[PDB]
Design a protein around this ligand. Structure first.
Ligand SMILES: [Zn+2]
Ligand SMILES: [Zn+2]
Lengths: 257, 257
């Protein structure tokens, strides 16, 4: 897997990335012939395929329509994984322009997704951050929060990075306690999914309210409350782990009615 | 949390590390007054406490008794976590002597376990690699392998790094297939534990044999076979995730007898 100059008849999906953003003209991920996106002559890297068509990464700034890769979730959750990894790879290259061991310039491996040193023998691989995500059920109610980071009107479940020395279970209890001040029980693992940028592994849990009153960390959350399961506010998009977890909670509440 | 010169009456546990090894005179982790280990005047960093006593990291080479931090598992599994993190932290510093973004020298944060840049605003955090570990049951039998890496006579279960774009479940199936050529079913998550060096999060699964004949990747394993549950060879130490998983398998087989 090596980079190359785009030609006129090159076709596929174009992940055109600059400064942790990607280009989404008309709010869509560029699809089609390179010439229609003024991409001929640019250097691109194939980072995957989607529906038997290449996905290309290109590092270029555009004047308009640069945005976060989260916007792609709402387009297609599968393509989101490809596009975000593109964005992550550009950031991985940027954070390893110089060798942390010896200070010389690095260059990308051709046989792995790695950064190699022009001088020494060391190398770097992109990291995957373990993450928890948890839906907390209180009887016929579920805890949903609006996050400060997004400010997008979407009510969702709690999530955080696993810290050094912690199990997933300890990460769940800690994160919940920190963000909302509640204690949980009946922790149960339900599934996992990759998240592409920042590159992470989300482990999804279900849990029941144990004790405490909600007091939000304002650095993390704007609002948090218990919402009756059959009367929920605006939720994350269908197909996301967050949404699937909320809907399973709804399904279990339905089961006790 | 800042480093400092060891004085005569300093006391505690001494993680004395050089080149990914630590000092284990008489095969034990140094415990006691600094003066008894010729450590006075060395620069140390407190990385934790164990049984209300500080754990100190010191970067120094010793002539004898330098070894892998795995040796500490057999001493104490809890102290293992502290010591290995010490070793990991020394490696984290070494891999970030220079800034990957701009090439200038870095220096350790005093308020977080992070590396800060003398020139720019970027920073690095130690990574935690998500890992799977799986015990495969075939009826009254369990799959145990001897690994090429260790060559220590210990028969254990299968484990591997989660790769980009994979769920934990996909990582289990892939790793098993790759190392042993068997297909599994009834994947179930049982628990998680941190591993300190290389710093990782181990998610432990239980699984049942589905299909295939054992063909080992010699790069990974020396030997692999099915072992009757009540007649097992040499196992990993009590208290490890690997051991606990093997013993739960034994417990379930016992339950069907
Ligand atoms: Zn180098
Ligand atoms: Zn820098």
């Amino acid at each position: 897997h090596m980079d190359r100059i785009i030609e006129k008849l090159d076709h596929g999906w174009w992940v055109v990335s600059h400064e942790q953003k990607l280009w989404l003209p008309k709010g869509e991920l560029p699809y089609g012939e390179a010439a229609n996106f003024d991409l001929v002559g640019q250097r691109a890297l194939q980072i995957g395929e989607w529906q038997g068509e290449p996905v290309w990464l290109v590092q270029q700034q555009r004047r308009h329509d640069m945005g976060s890769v989260r916007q792609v979730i709402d387009l297609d959750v599968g393509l989101f994984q490809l596009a975000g990894r593109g964005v992550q790879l550009a950031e991985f290259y940027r954070s390893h322009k110089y060798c942390g061991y010896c200070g010389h310039e690095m260059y990308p491996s051709k046989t792995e997704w790695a950064m190699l040193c022009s001088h020494c023998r060391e190398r770097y691989y992109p990291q995957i951050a373990p993450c928890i995500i948890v839906a907390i059920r209180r009887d016929d109610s579920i805890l949903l929060a609006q996050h400060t980071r997004h400010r997008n009107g979407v009510h969702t479940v709690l999530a955080g990075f696993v810290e050094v020395g912690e199990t997933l279970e300890q990460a769940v209890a800690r994160e919940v306690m920190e963000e909302s001040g509640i204690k949980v029980k009946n922790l149960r693992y339900v599934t996992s999914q990759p998240w592409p940028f920042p590159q992470s592994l989300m482990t999804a849990f279900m849990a029941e309210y144990d004790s405490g009153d909600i007091v939000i960390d304002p650095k993390e959350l704007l609002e948090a409350n218990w919402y009756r399961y059959d009367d929920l506010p605006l939720l994350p998009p269908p197909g996301t782990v967050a949404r699937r977890l909320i809907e399973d909670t709804v399904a279990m509440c339905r089961a006790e009615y």
